[PDB]
Amino acid sequence: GPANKVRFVTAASLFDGHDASINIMRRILQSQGCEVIHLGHNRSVQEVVTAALQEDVQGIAISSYQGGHVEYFKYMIDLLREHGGEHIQVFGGGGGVIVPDEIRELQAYGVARIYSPE
Amino acid sequence: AGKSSLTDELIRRFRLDQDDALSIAVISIDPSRRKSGGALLGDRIRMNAINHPNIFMRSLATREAGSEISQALPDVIAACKAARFDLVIVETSGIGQGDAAIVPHVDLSLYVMTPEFGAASQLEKIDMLDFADFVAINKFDRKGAQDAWRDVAKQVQRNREQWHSRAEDMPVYGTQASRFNDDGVTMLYQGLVGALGARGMSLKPGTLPNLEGRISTGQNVIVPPARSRYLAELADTVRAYHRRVVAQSKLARERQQLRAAHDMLQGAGHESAALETLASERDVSLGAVERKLLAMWPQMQQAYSGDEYVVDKEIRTGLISTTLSGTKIRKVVLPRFEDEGEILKWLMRENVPGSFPYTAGVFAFKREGEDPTRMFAGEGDAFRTNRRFKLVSEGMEAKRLSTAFDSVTLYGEDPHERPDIYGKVGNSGVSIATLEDMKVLYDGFDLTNPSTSVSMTINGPAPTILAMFMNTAIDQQIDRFRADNGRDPTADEEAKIRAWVLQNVRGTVQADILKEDQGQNTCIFSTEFSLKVMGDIQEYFVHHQVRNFYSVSISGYHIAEAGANPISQLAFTLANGFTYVEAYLARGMHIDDFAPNLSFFFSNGMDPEYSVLGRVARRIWAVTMRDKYGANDRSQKLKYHIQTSGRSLHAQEIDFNDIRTTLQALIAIYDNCNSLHTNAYDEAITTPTAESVRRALAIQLIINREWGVAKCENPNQGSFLIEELTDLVEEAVLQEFERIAERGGVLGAMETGYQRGKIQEESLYYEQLKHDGTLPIIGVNTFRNPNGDPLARSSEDEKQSQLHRLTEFHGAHQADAEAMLARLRQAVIDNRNVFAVLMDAVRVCSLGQITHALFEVGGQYRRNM
Amino acid sequence: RAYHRRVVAQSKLARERQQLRAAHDMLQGAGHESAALETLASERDVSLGAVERKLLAMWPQMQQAYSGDEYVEIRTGLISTTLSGTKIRKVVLPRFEDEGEILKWLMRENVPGSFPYTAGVFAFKREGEDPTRMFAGEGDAFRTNRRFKLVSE
Amino acid sequence: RSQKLKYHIQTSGRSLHAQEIDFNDIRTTLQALIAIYDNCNSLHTNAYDEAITTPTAESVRRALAIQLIINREWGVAKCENPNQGSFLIEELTDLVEEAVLQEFERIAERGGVLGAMETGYQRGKIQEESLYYEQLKHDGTLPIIGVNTFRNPNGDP
Numbered sequence A: 001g002p003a004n005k006v007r008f009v010t011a012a013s014l015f016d017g018h019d020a021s022i023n024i025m026r027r028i029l030q031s032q033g034c035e036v037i038h039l040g041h042n043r044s045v046q047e048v049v050t051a052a053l054q055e056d057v058q059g060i061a062i063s064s065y066q067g068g069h070v071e072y073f074k075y076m077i078d079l080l081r082e083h084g085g086e087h088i089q090v091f092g093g094g095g096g097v098i099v100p101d102e103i104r105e106l107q108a109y110g111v112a113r114i115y116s117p118e
Numbered sequence B: 001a002g003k004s005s006l007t008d009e010l011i012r013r014f015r016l017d018q019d020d021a022l023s024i025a026v027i028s029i030d031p032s033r034r035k036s037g038g039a040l041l042g043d044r045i046r047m048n049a050i051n052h053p054n055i056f057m058r059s060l061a062t063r064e065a066g067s068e069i070s071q072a073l074p075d076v077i078a079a080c081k082a083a084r085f086d087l088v089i090v091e092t093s094g095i096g097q098g099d100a101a102i103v104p105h106v107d108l109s110l111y112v113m114t115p116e117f118g119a120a121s122q123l124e125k126i127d128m129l130d131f132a133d134f135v136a137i138n139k140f141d142r143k144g145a146q147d148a149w150r151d152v153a154k155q156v157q158r159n160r161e162q163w164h165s166r167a168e169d170m171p172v173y174g175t176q177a178s179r180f181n182d183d184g185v186t187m188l189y190q191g192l193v194g195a196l197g198a199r200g201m202s203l204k205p206g207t208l209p210n211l212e213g214r215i216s217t218g219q220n221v222i223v224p225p226a227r228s229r230y231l232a233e234l235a236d237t238v239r240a241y242h243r244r245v246v247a248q249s250k251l252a253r254e255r256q257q258l259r260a261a262h263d264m265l266q267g268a269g270h271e272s273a274a275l276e277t278l279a280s281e282r283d284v285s286l287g288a289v290e291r292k293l294l295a296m297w298p299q300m301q302q303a304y305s306g307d308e309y310v311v312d313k314e315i316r317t318g319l320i321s322t323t324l325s326g327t328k329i330r331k332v333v334l335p336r337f338e339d340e341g342e343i344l345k346w347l348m349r350e351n352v353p354g355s356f357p358y359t360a361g362v363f364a365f366k367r368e369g370e371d372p373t374r375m376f377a378g379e380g381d382a383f384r385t386n387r388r389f390k391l392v393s394e395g396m397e398a399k400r401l402s403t404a405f406d407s408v409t410l411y412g413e414d415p416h417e418r419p420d421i422y423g424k425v426g427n428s429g430v431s432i433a434t435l436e437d438m439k440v441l442y443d444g445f446d447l448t449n450p451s452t453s454v455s456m457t458i459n460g461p462a463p464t465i466l467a468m469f470m471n472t473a474i475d476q477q478i479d480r481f482r483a484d485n486g487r488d489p490t491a492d493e494e495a496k497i498r499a500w501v502l503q504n505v506r507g508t509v510q511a512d513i514l515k516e517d518q519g520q521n522t523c524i525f526s527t528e529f530s531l532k533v534m535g536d537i538q539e540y541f542v543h544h545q546v547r548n549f550y551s552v553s554i555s556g557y558h559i560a561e562a563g564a565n566p567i568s569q570l571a572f573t574l575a576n577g578f579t580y581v582e583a584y585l586a587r588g589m590h591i592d593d594f595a596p597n598l599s600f601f602f603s604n605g606m607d608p609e610y611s612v613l614g615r616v617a618r619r620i621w622a623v624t625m626r627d628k629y630g631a632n633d634r635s636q637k638l639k640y641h642i643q644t645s646g647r648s649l650h651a652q653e654i655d656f657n658d659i660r661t662t663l664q665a666l667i668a669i670y671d672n673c674n675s676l677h678t679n680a681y682d683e684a685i686t687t688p689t690a691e692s693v694r695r696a697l698a699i700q701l702i703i704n705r706e707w708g709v710a711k712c713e714n715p716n717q718g719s720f721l722i723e724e725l726t727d728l729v730e731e732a733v734l735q736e737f738e739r740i741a742e743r744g745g746v747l748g749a750m751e752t753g754y755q756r757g758k759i760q761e762e763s764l765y766y767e768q769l770k771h772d773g774t775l776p777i778i779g780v781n782t783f784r785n786p787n788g789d790p791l792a793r794s795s796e797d798e799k800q801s802q803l804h805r806l807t808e809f810h811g812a813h814q815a816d817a818e819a820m821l822a823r824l825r826q827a828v829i830d831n832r833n834v835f836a837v838l839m840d841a842v843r844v845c846s847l848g849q850i851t852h853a854l855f856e857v858g859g860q861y862r863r864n865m
Numbered sequence C: 001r002a003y004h005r006r007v008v009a010q011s012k013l014a015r016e017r018q019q020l021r022a023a024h025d026m027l028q029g030a031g032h033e034s035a036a037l038e039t040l041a042s043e044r045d046v047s048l049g050a051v052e053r054k055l056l057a058m059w060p061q062m063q064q065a066y067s068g069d070e071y072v073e074i075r076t077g078l079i080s081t082t083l084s085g086t087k088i089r090k091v092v093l094p095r096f097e098d099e100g101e102i103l104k105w106l107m108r109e110n111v112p113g114s115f116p117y118t119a120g121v122f123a124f125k126r127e128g129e130d131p132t133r134m135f136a137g138e139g140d141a142f143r144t145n146r147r148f149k150l151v152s153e
Numbered sequence D: 001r002s003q004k005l006k007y008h009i010q011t012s013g014r015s016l017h018a019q020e021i022d023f024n025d026i027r028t029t030l031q032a033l034i035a036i037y038d039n040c041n042s043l044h045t046n047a048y049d050e051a052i053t054t055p056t057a058e059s060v061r062r063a064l065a066i067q068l069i070i071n072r073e074w075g076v077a078k079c080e081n082p083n084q085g086s087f088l089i090e091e092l093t094d095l096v097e098e099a100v101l102q103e104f105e106r107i108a109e110r111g112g113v114l115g116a117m118e119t120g121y122q123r124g125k126i127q128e129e130s131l132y133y134e135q136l137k138h139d140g141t142l143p144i145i146g147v148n149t150f151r152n153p154n155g156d157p
């Protein structure tokens, strides 16, 4: 199994009410032996990052179904590097709102992975 | 028991009391499940008052089988203590009875419990009641909380052997963290401070009102617990009305049968006046109103018989539209029942349009005039939307504007450089941040003009936006006075103008808080707080005779889009509507003052129940408003807007959508709706084109003008299917009323997430059948196309404009900014009228500033799971 | 027109027959009895036609048929349950208490599949075939044969 | 078996116009609905471009979808006698029936159908009612959406 105790911060992006999917991901994470600090929905980058930094997690899972995801993750990647959290891995799963050209872009920016519906 | 909830509120008290001077570290512990190995550290999600540099929180899993704390707690604490914090708050997981591991690692201990602890003897088993420096009986709004306080306070007195003290003096507090600015929590806080203070802690003299006492006064409850079962009471009210209909009908039937048989004896010779004796008994048995109904029936028939509706000033109205064939189509077709039992039954259950219970409509006849062209505009900044408004409303006398705000404004925030906000500004709605932006939005338009009404859909920040709109309408007349006279109005002249504006201003805020949490999940303020301010607005309207503006539009559209079936949508929406009624009543307001200003909003789908939705909504309202609340005719008339279902509009084969939108528009018009919106066929893919919006508008024009059956205004009435479906749907709604009532009313059900739960259920049941092929959708899961399976909206300059106009506004009111914001908070603490302050606040504060101020005082929506 | 004039006449006869026997039962519940009412009602029994009398006779039995979830030999579904849980009856019968209205309705607009077949010539709509029949025809026999298969795909 | 009149209803092509052909599906829907409501034995639905050409491949699907949507998706159609009971339906049924009977009489006093055809009574009455329709359509008395009202500013042809 896992070597260390893996901590996560999960949340839905800003103004994104749809947390139906992110509440499923935090259950699978939990069942696989992860300590999940769930933040719920409507979370700004400044919030999520502050949570991740204080909790000192290994990973961040953000769902975005309202669009504006590119600028959002870029902000988070930037803000994480600035305040000593570049080794924290950011993950994306906004269903299919993110097209391949945007997945490739964000992953190149600093985002760990963005999972395509494929 | 509300561990995290109470903790968050306590931190907020620290921040408010010491003006954010204290550096507080929060160490949370939750149990880790031994099977999974994982843990749900779900304490941070409840924390609203930790978003500040002086606050630090680290969530921990117990990482131990039979422990309520982490085995590494003392080191973690020591680290925080060394980090030069002012106070370290540690919380454990769910305690048993014998568990009390927090006691040695902390200086002060606070046991938190609920009024449900079992028999009083159970308190003699709880080890923590023997060590706790403070005990907080949270959720003090539950049943048996008062007795729970007595029992616990006595037990702590007994444990401490302080029989020389009063039980009411024990450190046992009755708190209710769920409610904003709870005095109970403050009372607990006052105690904690004195204890911490004596135990070596520097604290400034408190700014919080030093409240004495031990229990929460249960202040700021919206719907009083005495009125908890209001929805059930309404269900009984309607059912009682129907049982009367059955009884009175039988009486009317027998009365007619007797006098009929009596006349047949006199024609045959031999007579028996014992028949008349029985008939005379029926005359008194029949009610006063029931008797007058049958009395006016022959006269009623003669009225609708002619070609004109003759009703010492007269008003004639056309009753007949002659067809192309020469056939006369009556607008309202009356039944041809010979049985007086049926006549009475029909007059009580489904009277003609414009008569109680207004089942077939609230008005006598449909308006012959052209439909009120709703001119909705909203995109970019205030300048662009104002242009859009003026371009559509060119040359028309009916200035009927409908405003849409961008997501930034919809959440009460100011536009900002921040990437998570900047992108949202201007996109999908107008960006309104300051009162200046609001004035630009409605420039040129005379808001006080009798032929100008302004609709605007805003929910969370509605009271603030309304305050801006009011100040705009007022300043428009202050400007018009300084222009007509050349001199500024005096103190007496201005106040005379200002008061006149408030009365005559027309418009509507499409605000519905109860829809926000139930279907949408879009709340920015706590439901209880919004309702308080909602009442504050309605109270303000009363005081200044604001009789031409509407502050509440009760929607169920978003609920339906979320997956709710027609019965759930109708029932929840009416329930919400009744909640608003109950809320305004508890504030001590008269029913005939706010009931006529209640708009409704439903979604029309393909389901059978949709055909009889409007009529059911009208009868349930009309009956209860007359019987339960005893309101006038103008209040018994439920007026609603129907918008065709977007849930039924698909991206697969979009040309089919007009077929569905037609059928939905038809039953809406058939059932005498008050307002109809028709969706474009490509709303499921792209932005409604100017061509696509014509096809949508043509559906209404074709039905209203070309369609023959629509020439008749009550075509639904009489149908065996309609009357049965009306009865079925009505009953189903009543039963739903009962289920919500036995959950503490609408608000109580929202605590359990009962609405959101049921909606999500019915949504999946739809999806299951849709995917299964069970529920057929043409073009989607059947009759699929063989040939194949298948912007910006805001200028960069516009975004920079809003940013510039904001910082310009902020600098222009830098002096009066903080002073006004503090005044606003104090009005919430002192439980004053919030909207009253907003009327002054919006002139020196921005939307974001006001919203975040109300966040600080505690009105912010707390997430849950 | 003659059929209609009979509907009016027979309806009044059915109405009076019910009114008399109704008033007659209400006297027996009060105490004093007048059998002269029954004498008038008995005259209505003969006045009502043979087919008209059988119509009202089968009406309560007719209501029980369309009341269930099946139309019971062979059986047929009567109810389609909605997405909300509401039961939609295929054929909805009137709820008239007046036997004058019942007879009037049974003669002028009986249920689908019964004389005068106003609401349809069949009892229930057929599951197999929709009323759908689309107009086709283009070019030679070979091309239309392909269009026929396309429509009935 | 003989008292049962079985009929086929086809939607009106007279009501389908070349001006704004996208509107025709709206009209063809409403006509299909009452046909299905009133328990017709057979239904043909016209394509939205009926006034221009013979139904194309895509346009015959939109026509066929009108029937499929009403029969499968439409809720009120789940009930097979929704017309019955309606005060409007029963009155209109009575009115139309009587009007037909009176027309029966006018033809009878012309020597029956054949005798009336000698005078060209049918062809005459038809041509009359046709012009009365055109006299009102052209005038604006009888509104036709997209044709004599709500005309498209952008669409010249």
Ligand SMILES: CCCC(=O)SCCNC(=O)CCNC(=O)[C@H](O)C(C)(C)COP(=O)(O)OP(=O)(O)OC[C@H]1O[C@@H](n2cnc3c(N)ncnc32)[C@H](O)[C@@H]1OP(=O)(O)O
Residues within 6 Å of the ligand: C122, C123, C124, C125, C126, C129, C133, C135, D001, D006, D007, D008, D010, D041, D042, D044
């Ligand atoms: C500009 C040019 C325009 C033009 O000229 S377009 C003209 C093209 N013609 C058409 O579109 C329609 C043609 N006519 C027909 O299809 C038929 O005459 C008709 C009557 C409308 C339909 O016939 P069908 O659909 O085949 O069914 P049917 O009435 O003949 O009866 C068939 C037998 O099957 C049974 N059946 C069918 N449906 C039933 C039901 N719902 N309940 C109980 N039994 C049922 C039944 O046995 C029936 O026979 P029977 O009634 O016992 O004698």
